[PDB]
Amino acid sequence: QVQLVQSGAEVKKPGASVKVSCKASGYTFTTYAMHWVRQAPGQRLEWMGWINAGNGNTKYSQKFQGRVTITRDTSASTAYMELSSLRSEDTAVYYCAGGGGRRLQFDYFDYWGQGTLVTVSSASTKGPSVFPLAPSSKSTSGGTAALGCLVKDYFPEPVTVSWNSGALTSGVHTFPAVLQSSGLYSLSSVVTVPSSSLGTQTYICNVNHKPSNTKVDKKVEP
Amino acid sequence: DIQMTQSPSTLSASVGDRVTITCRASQSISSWLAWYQQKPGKAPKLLIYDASSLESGVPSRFSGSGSGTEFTLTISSLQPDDFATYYCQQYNGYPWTFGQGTKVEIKRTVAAPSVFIFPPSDEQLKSGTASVVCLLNNFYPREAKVQWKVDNALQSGNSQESVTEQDSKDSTYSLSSTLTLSKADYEKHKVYACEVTHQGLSSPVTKSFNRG
Amino acid sequence: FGEVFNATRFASVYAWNRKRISNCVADYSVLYNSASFSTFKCYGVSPTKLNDLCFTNVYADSFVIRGDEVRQIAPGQTGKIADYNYKLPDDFTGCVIAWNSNNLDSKVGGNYNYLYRLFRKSNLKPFERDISTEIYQAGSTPCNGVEGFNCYFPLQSYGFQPTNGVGYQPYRVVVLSFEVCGPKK
Numbered sequence: 001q002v003q004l005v006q007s008g009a010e011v012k013k014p015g016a017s018v019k020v021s022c023k024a025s026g027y028t029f030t031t032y033a034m035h036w037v038r039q040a041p042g043q044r045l046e047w048m049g050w051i052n053a054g055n056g057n058t059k060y061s062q063k064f065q066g067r068v069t070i071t072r073d074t075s076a077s078t079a080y081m082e083l084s085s086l087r088s089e090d091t092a093v094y095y096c097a098g099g100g101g102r103r104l105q106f107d108y109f110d111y112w113g114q115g116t117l118v119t120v121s122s123a124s125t126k127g128p129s130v131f132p133l134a135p136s137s138k139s140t141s142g143g144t145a146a147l148g149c150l151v152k153d154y155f156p157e158p159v160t161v162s163w164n165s166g167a168l169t170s171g172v173h174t175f176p177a178v179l180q181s182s183g184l185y186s187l188s189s190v191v192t193v194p195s196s197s198l199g200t201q202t203y204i205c206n207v208n209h210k211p212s213n214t215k216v217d218k219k220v221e222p
Numbered sequence: 223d224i225q226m227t228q229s230p231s232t233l234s235a236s237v238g239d240r241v242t243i244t245c246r247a248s249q250s251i252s253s254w255l256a257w258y259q260q261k262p263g264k265a266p267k268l269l270i271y272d273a274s275s276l277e278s279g280v281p282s283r284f285s286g287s288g289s290g291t292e293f294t295l296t297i298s299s300l301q302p303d304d305f306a307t308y309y310c311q312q313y314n315g316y317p318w319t320f321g322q323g324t325k326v327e328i329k330r331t332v333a334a335p336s337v338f339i340f341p342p343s344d345e346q347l348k349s350g351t352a353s354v355v356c357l358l359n360n361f362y363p364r365e366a367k368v369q370w371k372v373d374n375a376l377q378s379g380n381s382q383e384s385v386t387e388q389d390s391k392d393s394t395y396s397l398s399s400t401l402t403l404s405k406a407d408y409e410k411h412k413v414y415a416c417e418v419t420h421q422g423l424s425s426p427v428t429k430s431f432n433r434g
Numbered sequence: 435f436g437e438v439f440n441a442t443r444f445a446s447v448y449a450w451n452r453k454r455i456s457n458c459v460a461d462y463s464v465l466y467n468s469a470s471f472s473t474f475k476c477y478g479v480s481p482t483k484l485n486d487l488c489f490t491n492v493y494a495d496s497f498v499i500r501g502d503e504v505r506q507i508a509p510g511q512t513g514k515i516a517d518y519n520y521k522l523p524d525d526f527t528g529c530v531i532a533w534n535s536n537n538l539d540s541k542v543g544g545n546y547n548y549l550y551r552l553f554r555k556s557n558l559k560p561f562e563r564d565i566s567t568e569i570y571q572a573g574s575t576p577c578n579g580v581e582g583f584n585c586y587f588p589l590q591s592y593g594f595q596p597t598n599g600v601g602y603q604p605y606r607v608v609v610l611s612f613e614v615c616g617p618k619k
Contacts, residue, residue, distance in 0.1 A: 031549070031567070031589070045266075045309070045320040054567075055587050059546075061317050095265065104446075104589070105546045107313040108256045110277070114265040133340050133355065139429075146338045146357055173359075173396050175384045188384065188398050190357065192336075252538050253442060272442060315542040 002026055002111050004096045009117035011156055012086050020116050022096035023078040029053070033098035033105055034072060034079040040092045050098070051079055083118075090120045119156055123183045127212045128154035130205075132220035133190065140195050147220055148190035149205030153182070160208040161189045168193075168203065198222055224312045225249060228321035234363075235300055235326045243295040243324050245310030253289045254314035260307040260323075262387060270295065300326070327363065328393040334422040335361030335397075339429050342408070352408045354401040356416030356429070360394040363421070368399045371415040371428070377401065409433070435465060438494040439531065442538060444606050446548045447507075447519035448589060450497035450563050453608075460492060460614040461485050462529075471533040472605075477509050478527030479612060488615030493528070495520065495609045498539060498548055498594070501601040504532050507609075518551045518588075523560040528611040536596045539604035545594035548604070552590035561611075 006022030026032055031054030039045050049060040051070040060068055072079035079096070099111030133148030151159050161174055174189045189205065199222060207216045225248030235241045245255065257270035269277055270286040273293055283297040283304075297304060305328070310321040340355035358366060364385060370377040380403060386396040399416060415430030438453045445451050462484035465471070474481050497520055499507065506515035509526040516522050522530075539545065551558070553570035567589040569577035575584035594604045 044322070047318045054589075055581065057591070059543075063317065103547065104449075104549055107318065107541070107546070108268065108271050108311070109258075109266070110268055110271075112265040131343050131346055134343070135338070135340070139338055141336050141338075146336075146359065148340070148355075150353070150355075152353075173386055175386050175396075175398055178382060178384055188355070188400070190396075190398070192359065274442075313541070 002099050002101060004099070004111055004113040006096055006113045006116055009119075009157075011119045011121065014087055014120060014122060016086055017082060017084045018086055018118060019080060019082055020094050020118070021078055021080040022113050023076065024053075024099070026077070026099065026101065028101060029077065030101070031055075031104045032077075033100040034070070034096070035098035035109065036070065036081060037095045037097060037109065038092050039095065040089075048081075048094075051081075053077075053079060053098075054104075086120045088120055088122075090118070092118060094118055117157070121156065121183060123155050125211050126153065126155045126184070127214045128152075128159050128207055128209050128216065129186075130207055130216045130218050132205075132218050133188075134220050134222050135195075135198075136222075137195075143195045144192055145195040145198060146190055146192040147203065147222075148188060149207065149218060149220070150186075150188050151207055152186045153180075153184045154187075154209060154212075155183075155185055156211060157185065159187055161187070162206045162208075163191060164202070164204055165206050223317060224251075224315050224319060226310065226312060226319050226321050228310055228324055230324070231322055232325055232327075234329050235304075236329045237300050237302065239300045240296070240298060241300065241304075241326055243308055243310075245293040245295070245321055247291050247293070247312060249291075251291060251293075251312055251314045254312055255286075255293050256311045256313070257284075257286060257295050258309040258311065260309060262306070264306075266309070327388055330362065330393055332422040333360055333362040333394055335359060335366070335418065335420060337416075337418060337427060337429050339416060339431060341414075341431055341434070347405070347408070350405060352403050352405060354403075354414060354416075356399040356401075356418075358397040358399075358418060358420075360392065360396065361420055361422065362394050364388070364395045365421070366395075366397055367419040368397070369417045369419075370399070370401050371417055371430070372401075373411045373413060435461070438496060439465075439608055440470070440533070440535065440538075440606065441496075443547075444496050444498045444535070444539065444604075446592065447497045447499055447503075447515055447550050448563065448567075449565050450495045450520050452611075453494035453496060454491060455494050455610075456489075456491045456614045458614065459616060460487075460489070461616065463616075465531070471531045473504065473532035474529060475532070476529035478525075479529070481529050484529065486616045488618065489612040491613050493609070493611045493613075495607075495611070498535070498545075498592070498604040498606055499532075499550075500592070500594075501534075501599070501603055501605060503550075504605045504607065507607070514550070514552065518554045518558050521558050521560045521562060522609070526609075526611060527613070528609055530607060530609045532605045532607045534600060535604050535606040536594075539606065540594045540596045540598070542595050542597065545592050545604065548592035548594060549589040550592050551588040553586040554588045 003025040035050040036048030070081040094116040096113035097109040100106040129152035135145040253273040255273040259267040285296040335358035338357040417428040419426040506513035570586040571577040572584035577585035
């Protein structure tokens with residue numbers, strides 16, 4: 001089966017230039033059909049362009065006229081692209097696709113790369129802010145109460161969060177990150193437990209941030 | 223450019239059922255379309271191209287139809303394997319756009335949320351900004367209406383809403399509303415509340431507290 | 435007929451697919467009365483009485499060309515099609531049916547799914563669909579996969595946009611070389 005693989009996650013800064021790249025796995029090279037597309041986080045897919053993996057043809061999109069370029073390397077048979085004059089709106093996931101294979105060319109996307117993450121930001125790596133989320137006996141609902149571990153003002157994606165290092169698995173809830181006006185990321189993780197063993201047991205969140213190498217644990221005080 | 227809108231934006235279903243999808247084009251198309259499936263946290267699947275053809279490697283449920291303008295997607299029975307969005311793509315002409323997005327969920331009873339509130343911790347109070355959490359757990363369907371009432375007054379702009387995405391077996395929804403403010407705000411307002419109206423609830427429900 | 439005639443799409447003149455449509459009632463009377471095909475060029479046989487005429491096996495070379503390259507294909511007259519893409523031998527005993535198909539073929543900005551040999555390395559042979567787009571080597575500089583001086587990639591984008599004139603538009607052509615009658619009872 002034809003497969004497409006590419007580079008990893010990748011964090012740039014307004015005004016800079018960026019290069020993503022994917023290697024192909026093709027039974028044939030019959031004017032292969034490298035054809036890039038884009039995906040702004042959870043909104044319309046908007047189309048990138050197509051290079052002619054056959055020889056050299058470089059047809060591009062209108063909205064990205066004049067700032068995006070693509071080529072390919074033959075004996076590596078990979079395809080590369082620039083992407084220039086980056087801006088904040090530019091943050092997205094980036095897809096290789098194509099691979100018509102049987103016929104010479106198409107205009108549909110039948111062999112996708114499983115995705116590249118590009119984040120255009122102006123801030124820098126920063127450790128995660130962490131606070132507990134202590135419930136109250138006022139809201140004892142069926143003998144069960146919620147409890148959490150807030151992370152604020154962190155960069156960049158993401159922050160793996162567990163509870164007591166995998167000791168708890170029931171009712172686990174980890175909400176997705178959200179932008180703030182400051183350009184910073186924030187997450188709220190919560191879980192509910194029977195209130196019967198509230199003041200008799202121990203629950204600690206375990207937050208993990210590799211880009212800053214920080215590992216933070218905080219006991220919650222009800 | 224080629225215009226593309228798709229109806230409805232969201233739909234409902236249950237396992238072992240048929241779900242219709244309609245892709246609407248403003249302007250004439252000659253069977254120039256593909257249907258894609260999109261799982262969360264994923265790279266897309268194609269399963270219809272050309273508005274009719276069924277590409278290999280797929281379950282036989284899938285079937286496109288339509289030509290001209292109205293385009294339709296069909297599946298006979300509903301596997302769990304069908305729970306994702308679905309996109310339509312034109313390729314009649316230049317720059318090729320996509321649709322809006324059409325997801326199915328999992329239907330059941332109109333479960334009701336559990337409401338909770340978390341006041342700011344101290345350490346947040348000597349950070350310099352204040353955060354207040356209102357939580358809704360296990361409500362159905364996602365659709366919900368949350369408000370803030372501070373000192374018996376509505377608040378706007380300063381609140382953010384973050385919704386989890388439906389559970390695989392819990393098959394429900396959870397939501398967090400965060401109210402953020404500056405310390406000058408915190409002590410000159412003295413009582414706080416979050417209110418939620420939901421379809422499952424008999425009445426709109428308010429929850430609240432004061433300074434400690 | 436309609437299946438191998440006006441379909442959803444067709445092929446290019448470098449990879450024309452000859453479909454053996456035989457052992458059935460060959461109703462060419464309905465094709466003649468429909469007259470939805472600009473050209474009928476029945477060379478070798480009569481196209482009006484082709485329905486009753488009983489052959490043993492019929493073909494259907496399916497490909498698209500330009501309105502200027504629809505004349506190129508001819509039993510005898512050679513050119514970019516009848517000497518490099520689709521060669522029509524002088525023993526042609528069938529019917530070349532041609533009609534414009536911009537609606538279900540021409541994509542705006544030029545058809546990229548259709549590519550035709552502008553410079554085939556060697557001369558094409560009678561009734562041959564050369565699929566190898568080897569870079570033409572012009573005397574010196576052997577272009578065995580190499581590009582640049584004296585190197586000309588044969589397969590060239592078939593410019594087919596609906597904005598293009600009839601002379602540069604996809605002419606769906608299914609030629610039925612005869613080597614399958616009407617009622618016969």
